Structure 1
Amino acid sequence: DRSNFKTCDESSFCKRQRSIRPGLSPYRALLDTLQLGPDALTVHLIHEVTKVLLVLELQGLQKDMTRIRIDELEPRRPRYRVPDVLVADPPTARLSVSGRDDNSVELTVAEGPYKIILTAQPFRLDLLEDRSLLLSVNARGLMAFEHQRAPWEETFKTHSDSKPYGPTSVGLDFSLPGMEHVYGIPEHADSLRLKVTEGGEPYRLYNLDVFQYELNNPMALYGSVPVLLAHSFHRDLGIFWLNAAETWVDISSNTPQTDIRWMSESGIIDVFLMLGPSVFDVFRQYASLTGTQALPPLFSLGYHQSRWNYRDEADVLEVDQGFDDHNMPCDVIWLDIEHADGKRYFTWDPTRFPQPLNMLEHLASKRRKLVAIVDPHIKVDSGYRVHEELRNHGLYVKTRDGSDYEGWCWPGSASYPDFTNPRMRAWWSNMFSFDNYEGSAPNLYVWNDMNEPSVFNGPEVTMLKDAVHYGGWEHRDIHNIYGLYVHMATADGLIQRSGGIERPFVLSRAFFSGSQRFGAVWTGDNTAEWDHLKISIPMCLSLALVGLSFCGADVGGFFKNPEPELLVRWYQMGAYQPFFRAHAHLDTGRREPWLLASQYQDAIRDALFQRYSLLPFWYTLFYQAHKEGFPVMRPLWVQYPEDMSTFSIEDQFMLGDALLIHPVSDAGAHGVQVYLPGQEEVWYDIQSYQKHHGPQTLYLPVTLSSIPVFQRGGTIVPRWMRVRRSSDCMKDDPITLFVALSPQGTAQGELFLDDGHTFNYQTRHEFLLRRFSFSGSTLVSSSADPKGHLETPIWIERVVIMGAGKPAAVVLQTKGSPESRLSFQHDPETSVLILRKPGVSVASDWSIHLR
């Protein structure tokens, strides 16, 4: 039902802004007002017709970034500036006037090579490296800044927005010469490569709860990350539009060039230009602004079993026992909203969950966790202590008359805590203490849902625009960070309750720039259909590109009942995606994976075993995401930026640089077409060990149990081959190293290890980061970070080398030990070499030589 949701035409500020068409801009820079300052250049801008005066604050930043901020010179009221999203005040670089004429000022960033040309009339900005034009601002003249007038009224369906400040929208266009491919600005159920918007709707960024959302359309979904990446054969660029209000994004293609236009309801203009040149440079630039992916506790990278709803404690324990009785691993079982007392969060249903501590104790004895849902809407109920506290301390979102806002959600009438208020977030965080959240225990973690916020009787199923928050800001000013604040306060609560030691795990539905710092997200209420399975790749890839690496989609689909074959394929797909959770609507049939016929059970178990085997590899990729800001799941073009035939691929993806995945996503398929990229590159089919040379499109036959996965030559992948019932059971087990030799006979890899769940890696440097490297005929283990030490029994039980000949003998040397001889096995057909039981501690330097 789409009449529920505004098109751009039904949004009055989008209608106004979008009616401004490319032409001669009326804004002009007053070069007499220019001031060159310690951190920035300020210059007054004027609208030629209306004579409104604006101030442009232009900054060169360390790490080859430019920040452009535009506000009113003399505002009647302060405009919103997005707080808490930037992790630091970005370190600045000095600007120099290096050129000037009657209509222009040329600025140099530090000592070059980056330059900014400010054109006075019409106002324009051009960004250059040396003499190469990288990007233009306002080149199509689409800048629009509605200043605050003397204090319009708007209705949509049955909802009235009093709009006490009138029109205040802001917009600005950007020109990207040489760019034909843009990506990002999640969340949309649309393709990885963003489409032109010329003949249709703009992409919309407004966190919204869309019931039974459909595919291949630009409607706004639950989260909004206002970050766009541009990729060509020659360069990579990123644009970060730091605005928290409702935002529409127009995209047009025109020698090849792409123009981007952002239109936001309120706030200032605040945009970061991230100049690359490589996409990994862009990743680093964005990470320095908004931070990096929080390092997940290891268990949260395992398999999660969920549904709406498990019935009672007995059902939960039966599901737990079912996994062990059917030899399937699982780390977490999830409790949806029916576990609470009538959707009063932080409570337990007194009949079906009378003893939560005992249930959590039984799960801990299986070394498993539980996740409980906690939504931000609070039932209006004088017997509900949470509501009474928030009401009594004035911590609720308010209406203009000063009363607490009340809307409709799961428990009926409900109020919404003002998570933009730091006093409210501290209260929320303290509520997760084991004394306050009675029945919780250290192995209980949290799911924040409906945090857009979802309001059943509100406009577009969310909160009224003219609701009022901390400091008097309107809801329209802050909307897209409301969910992030819920995620943040919840994650802080899980840390504080442990005394600051335990890493959190929080899944969130709504999100914004910066949400990567607080845990995982998923793509909401998808559907049990083949095309929803397919779209999980481009949706999570668009999230990965903008820093949200901990992404997934409901395995099996949330709505409706998947056929067994679709469920098998979804497990295979999910097993290779970062957040791996099966979930299902209240009225679906039960689909725990052992309820299927044995052939389907077997394929699913095989997928679960592959995932658990790969946990050391997953954990290392997330450590690399946490330290460097590089995405875990990646489009092929990130690894092959010069191969134009990869720029739109979205039925394939990579994990790091080592594994290429092409899950089967069609019913009854007999094979898949796998594009194996890279000139002078080889790829190893990890099932058969067959080597394949790139570039080629390989037709690969499949059966029900097939998961097309290839390891890249030149890489070393660490695995736990002893699959146990949960990751906690595995965390002292020995590693098998899978070495895939390049055509040059080389390979390299890393491995991160720690206690699996605390901040000790950071506060005490209790961790290991190992480098494995192969060249000549020698495999070497060394430290990739000497600051890290760790007490661990983990050892190297096996090395598997693909693409190797038969050695005459194999010799191991490790510091502290005599030289030893290793037995080995060789397959001449596959050129696979298995080295038996090196037996060396993973914390030790060592080398293995093939003679």
Structure 2
Amino acid sequence: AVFYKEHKLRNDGLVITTNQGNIRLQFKSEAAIEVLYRADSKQLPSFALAQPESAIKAQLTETENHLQFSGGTLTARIQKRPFAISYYRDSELLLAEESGFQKINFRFYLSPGEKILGGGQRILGMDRRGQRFPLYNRAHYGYSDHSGQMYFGLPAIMSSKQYILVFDNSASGAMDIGKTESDILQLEAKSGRSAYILVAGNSYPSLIENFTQVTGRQPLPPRWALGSFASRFGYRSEAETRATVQKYKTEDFPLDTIVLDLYWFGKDIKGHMGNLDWDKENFPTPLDMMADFKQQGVKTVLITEPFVLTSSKRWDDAVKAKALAKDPQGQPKAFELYFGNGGIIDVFSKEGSRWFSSIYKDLSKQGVAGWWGDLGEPEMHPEDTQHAIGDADTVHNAYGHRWAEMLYQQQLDQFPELRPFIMMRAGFVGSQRYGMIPWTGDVSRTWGGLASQVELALQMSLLGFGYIHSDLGGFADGETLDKEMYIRWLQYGVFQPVYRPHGQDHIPSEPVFQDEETKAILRPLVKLRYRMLPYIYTAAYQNTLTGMPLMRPLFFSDEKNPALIDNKTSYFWGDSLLVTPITQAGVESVSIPAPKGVWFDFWKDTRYQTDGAPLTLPTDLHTIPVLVKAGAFMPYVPAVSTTEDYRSDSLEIHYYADASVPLAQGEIFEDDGKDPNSIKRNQFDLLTLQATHTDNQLHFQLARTGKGYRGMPERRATTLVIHNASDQYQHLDINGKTIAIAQADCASTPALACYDQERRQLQLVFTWGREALNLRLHK
């Protein structure tokens, strides 16, 4: 039995007293509220919130039976007797407490028909209603087509009613999404903070904008993060690492970054972890290695882990520095891991953080450009391990999150003019604000492992992680390459956030070590990835601005059709491309549930119109099915080997014209690819294109804003290819000057405007300078 007794309003927050204790309510924005039960008691702070101490002005009104506490769009309605809080957007019920709060336990009602995404990485179906699962980050080695518990859980859900609910608790716990009781959402933890956060929105984009506003926005990664990575588990030597960089050159595959797994610090998988320094028998001249790679535009990333083994060179020093978590007796805690016997660096302590940070600083000074943190669940984390702020079970799901924060802060302190690259396997809600780029762990080399990746990506993307990706080609076990699976996985790779093939080294993960057929297929696609950098990097910019994920689910296309929520086989890559990965062997055709409208075959230019019915496309081995939305501007630059050579002096833009799209817009974001302050300081060149398409005219308005950046081209040579262009356009005006449109020999003359009747493509070639440009095509 819980009932209201009294309330006070202090520092814009509502403090309610019930018979059971105090509850603190603070609006973190107009659309988001933090509800803290046991507010009078000492407890761990928020991990989810970017500004945990903010509380914006709200209005409180009181009635006989209720209080209402209201920000601009979200309202909390507090029923006095019995005590229960419910949440409204406008006049619409989002979520109501059932018994609410009662070791730690929250119970809410679910509405009939309500669909619930969430929980982070699980392979259960996109709608997790009907499922129960733990909140305890944990390895799932070799997973394929099913998982209730893996590396990176999130204590959060997204509802078809367009709210996001976060359980802001770091402890070992559980989520029961109407499994045990069909109309009850239950959140449980053994200990930790007794708080939740509700975020509302008017659309899925806005919801995500509102969520990332209070949990954190990902800073723009360095543009090289969008390039080709060489990786395996693991390069065994400097000579082998150099030979791999060389293989990319001699095989003509793009390469930005080479990744070094655990052999960089010892010759065996076991026994060396914690050395955190070069194994000189196998990496004899590592400074030269990294410098030599830098001359070829290639970055070096090194693996690190939380654990320091008692067999490692740094055990005695870690103990001396008090860097390791302790037992209740106060000695360093040691325990068995896969890798051997050892302790865990206490990233929650001053001592642990300074010690680990110093090691990162030193290696970064030597030439390391980015960082890979593996095993941050932490993979093994015995219950009686004590960290500075609590025991293992209490802090477990935030260890990785704090590890990212530590490393992020460290990298910014060392290199304030560079964007940190931090790739980790486990985090918390908000970890994206520390630049965390997650990957979906040790996936099996099976079709099932591939077939799960869109589900996993969308689930993480929706709740803050735009750069979620997979080990391309698969990671775990296998005895010989499954060639078709590998090709499909690396094709899909082009259209997902990070291009990082990676696997256990008994089978090659890198595309340069594949057979002639496989390379003939993948080489033009890895180059396509580079040619498409302006499209991808523009989506990255939008992710930084608004949280908008790079991969978007099919359900964004129609928010009034909740059945689309179940789709985990077709997704949007940026605004304009609907991608359907092939995820089983021998598939001869696919049925693509394209939204109502006009669509083009990305590869073949075929125009399709549909009023709802799916489109059936044949498959081939050299592509996966990709449709372009009518009204898309697809921007390309010439392929380079490394993003260090990126230029946009030459632009090629493809516009997909159709009379059904009378107004279309596109943008291309350009900056120096490296300055972490480029967006804040307007040191960029934002190119905008607008098409106006009427019965007798097609008009393009081109412009640039922003303050520019060093090396920005003043004038770009631009080729605009208009697909599905009318054969009736007779003239072009460029800023009022009339130019005839040639109707022959478009590929064989230096034509300024030419219509190719066989391809229905109208090509315009012009100089795009700093002033506004209008191109008018007239029948």
CA RMSD of aligned residues (A): 2.6
The answer to whether residue 575 in structure 2 is matched with residue 654 in structure 1 is: no
**Aligned equivalents of 2:451 and 2:552: distance in 1?**
16
State the match for 1:779 in structure 2: 700
Shift of 1:307: 0.6
**One of 310, 314, 318 as aligned partner of 2:243:** 318
**One of 129, 135, 140 as aligned partner of 1:210:** 140
Residues 685 and 404 of structure 1, relative CA distance in 2, 3 Å threshold: same
**Aligned equivalents of 1:345 and 1:186: distance in 2?**
32
User: 1:738, 1:801 within 8 Å by CA — same for their partners in 2?
Assistant: yes
Give, as a single letter, the amino acid of the residue that structure 2 aligns with 1:261: Q
State the match for 2:617 in structure 1: 700
Q: Which runs of 5+ in 1 are unaligned?
A: 1-25, 47-52, 146-168, 455-461
The answer to whether residue 503 in structure 2 is matched with residue 584 in structure 1 is: yes
Secondary structure of the corresponding residue to residue 400 of structure 2: helix
Secondary structure of the corresponding residue to residue 224 of structure 2: helix
Shift of 1:358: 1.4
Identity %: 23
Residues 65 and 343 of structure 1, relative CA distance in 2, 3 Å threshold: closer
**Aligned equivalents of 1:127 and 1:810: distance in 2?**
56
The answer to whether residue 53 in structure 2 is matched with residue 126 in structure 1 is: no
State the match for 2:60 in structure 1: 96
Shift of 1:388: 4.4
Shift of 1:510: 1.0
**One of 68, 71, 77 as aligned partner of 1:107:** 68
**Aligned equivalents of 2:668 and 2:82: distance in 1?**
54
Shift of 1:411: 5.4
Alignment of 1:287-298 (within 5 A): 287-298=212-223
Alignment of 1:604-623 (within 5 A): 604-623=522-541
Residues 629 and 173 of structure 1, relative CA distance in 2, 3 Å threshold: same
Give, as a single letter, the amino acid of the residue that structure 2 aligns with 1:573: Y
Give, as a single letter, the amino acid of the residue that structure 2 aligns with 1:565: E
State the match for 2:746 in structure 1: none
State the match for 1:528 in structure 2: 445
User: 1:60, 1:67 within 8 Å by CA — same for their partners in 2?
Assistant: yes
* Count of matched residue pairs: 752
Alignment of 1:722-761 (within 5 A): 722-742=638-658, 743-761=660-678
Residues 398-440 of structure 1 deviation map (CA, whole Å, 9 limit, x = unaligned): 110111111234653222111112453344334333xx22883
Secondary structure of the corresponding residue to residue 626 of structure 1: helix
**Aligned equivalents of 1:88 and 1:66: distance in 2?**
11
State the match for 2:44 in structure 1: 80
State the match for 1:839 in structure 2: 767
Give, as a single letter, the amino acid of the residue that structure 2 aligns with 1:370: T
TM-score under structure 1 length normalisation = 0.84
State the match for 1:273 in structure 2: 198
Shift of 1:532: 0.8
**Aligned equivalents of 1:419 and 1:521: distance in 2?**
19
Residues 796 and 128 of structure 1, relative CA distance in 2, 3 Å threshold: same
Give, as a single letter, the amino acid of the residue that structure 1 aligns with 2:177: I
User: 1:428, 1:493 within 8 Å by CA — same for their partners in 2?
Assistant: no
State the match for 1:353 in structure 2: 283
**Aligned equivalents of 2:285 and 2:754: distance in 1?**
54
Shift of 1:705: 0.5
State the match for 2:293 in structure 1: 363
Shift of 1:673: 1.0
**Aligned equivalents of 2:560 and 2:676: distance in 1?**
39
User: 1:127, 1:134 within 8 Å by CA — same for their partners in 2?
Assistant: yes
Residues 640 and 829 of structure 1, relative CA distance in 2, 3 Å threshold: farther
Residues 278 and 731 of structure 1, relative CA distance in 2, 3 Å threshold: same
Secondary structure of the corresponding residue to residue 500 of structure 2: strand
The answer to whether residue 20 in structure 2 is matched with residue 29 in structure 1 is: no
Residues 591 and 133 of structure 1, relative CA distance in 2, 3 Å threshold: closer
User: 2:233, 2:502 within 8 Å by CA — same for their partners in 1?
Assistant: yes
State the match for 1:568 in structure 2: 487
Give, as a single letter, the amino acid of the residue that structure 2 aligns with 1:808: Q
User: 1:245, 1:264 within 8 Å by CA — same for their partners in 2?
Assistant: yes
Shift of 1:529: 0.6
State the match for 2:730 in structure 1: 808
Residues 756 and 258 of structure 1, relative CA distance in 2, 3 Å threshold: farther
Secondary structure of the corresponding residue to residue 711 of structure 1: strand
Residues 261-286 of structure 1 deviation map (CA, whole Å, 9 limit, x = unaligned): 11112123211111212112211221
Secondary structure of the corresponding residue to residue 21 of structure 2: strand
Residues 34 and 243 of structure 1, relative CA distance in 2, 3 Å threshold: same
Residues 128 and 763 of structure 1, relative CA distance in 2, 3 Å threshold: closer
**Aligned equivalents of 1:349 and 1:665: distance in 2?**
40
State the match for 1:43 in structure 2: 16
**Aligned equivalents of 1:541 and 1:487: distance in 2?**
22
Residues 355 and 113 of structure 1, relative CA distance in 2, 3 Å threshold: closer
**One of 111, 125, 146 as aligned partner of 1:177:** 111
**One of 370, 373, 381 as aligned partner of 1:445:** 370
**Aligned equivalents of 1:339 and 1:709: distance in 2?**
40
Residues 551-608 of structure 1 deviation map (CA, whole Å, 9 limit, x = unaligned): 111111101244111110010011111022111124x223432443322221111321
State the match for 1:392 in structure 2: 320
Give, as a single letter, the amino acid of the residue that structure 2 aligns with 1:290: T
Residues 397 and 731 of structure 1, relative CA distance in 2, 3 Å threshold: farther
Shift of 1:482: 0.4
The answer to whether residue 745 in structure 2 is matched with residue 828 in structure 1 is: no
Deviates more, 1:572-581 or 1:644-653: 644-653
Residues 281 and 354 of structure 1, relative CA distance in 2, 3 Å threshold: same
Shift of 1:178: 5.5
State the match for 1:554 in structure 2: 471
Shift of 1:381: 5.3
**One of 599, 612, 621 as aligned partner of 2:517:** 599
The answer to whether residue 432 in structure 2 is matched with residue 432 in structure 1 is: no
Residues 428 and 369 of structure 1, relative CA distance in 2, 3 Å threshold: same
Residues 744 and 285 of structure 1, relative CA distance in 2, 3 Å threshold: closer
User: 1:395, 1:424 within 8 Å by CA — same for their partners in 2?
Assistant: yes
Residues 771 and 423 of structure 1, relative CA distance in 2, 3 Å threshold: farther
Q: Which runs of 5+ in 2 are unaligned?
A: 267-271, 741-750
User: 1:293, 1:550 within 8 Å by CA — same for their partners in 2?
Assistant: no
**Aligned equivalents of 1:381 and 1:439: distance in 2?**
26
Secondary structure of the corresponding residue to residue 736 of structure 1: strand
Deviates more, 1:293-302 or 1:762-771: 762-771
**Aligned equivalents of 2:437 and 2:43: distance in 1?**
31
Residues 87 and 355 of structure 1, relative CA distance in 2, 3 Å threshold: farther
**One of 662, 686, 695 as aligned partner of 1:769:** 686
**One of 675, 685, 699 as aligned partner of 2:601:** 685
Alignment of 1:189-588 (within 5 A): 189-197=123-131, 202-218=132-148, 220-231=149-160, 235-252=161-178, 259-341=184-266, 342-380=272-310, 383-384=313-314, 387-409=315-337, 412-433=340-361, 436-437=362-363, 440-441=366-367, 444-454=369-379, 462-471=380-389, 473-498=390-415, 500-517=416-433, 518-559=435-476, 560=478, 561-586=480-505, 588=506
Give, as a single letter, the amino acid of the residue that structure 2 aligns with 1:221: M
User: 1:431, 1:493 within 8 Å by CA — same for their partners in 2?
Assistant: no
**Aligned equivalents of 2:274 and 2:69: distance in 1?**
58
Secondary structure of the corresponding residue to residue 271 of structure 1: strand
Secondary structure of the corresponding residue to residue 8 of structure 2: strand
**Aligned equivalents of 2:317 and 2:48: distance in 1?**
25
**Aligned equivalents of 1:438 and 1:123: distance in 2?**
54
Shift of 1:519: 2.9
User: 1:345, 1:375 within 8 Å by CA — same for their partners in 2?
Assistant: no
Residues 534-556 of structure 1 deviation map (CA, whole Å, 9 limit, x = unaligned): 10000010000001011111111
Secondary structure of the corresponding residue to residue 581 of structure 1: coil
Residues 345 and 115 of structure 1, relative CA distance in 2, 3 Å threshold: same
Give, as a single letter, the amino acid of the residue that structure 1 aligns with 2:3: A
